[PDB]
Amino acid sequence: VLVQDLLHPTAASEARKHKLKTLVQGPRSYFLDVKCPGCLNITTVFSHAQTAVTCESCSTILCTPTGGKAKLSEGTSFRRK
Template identity: 65%
Template structure:
């Protein structure tokens, strides 16, 4: 009998379609994005379908691209884990 954990995704399992994985999980996530101009942090959905402006200086943080949103050059981000 093999000993492996179901909650730890393997590389092969991450590449699969979200519904064909051993444990179903979405491809989307939330992330904290730091503005390059004013260094304010904004929470953005990875598949945002609208242009997201910065709260402090109103510069564009991300643009929709038909799937995952495209971050503006110079913005730093980190993925949020639950």
């Protein structure tokens, strides 16, 4: 306060801010690869869903939508990228 660095602010206080009031705005959602070991391949899923995403071959499930991040379905794995 009174004198500080607006240009190079701490990673953490930037971290806790709203996604629109960061120094340069960016998302804070992500994508994942999801499995349900009946199948061998992996659909790519967005962290926020709206659409209850179905798998490639089997009419199984995967996740349900919510207010924000999707609730992933029961027996599943996930990596992030």
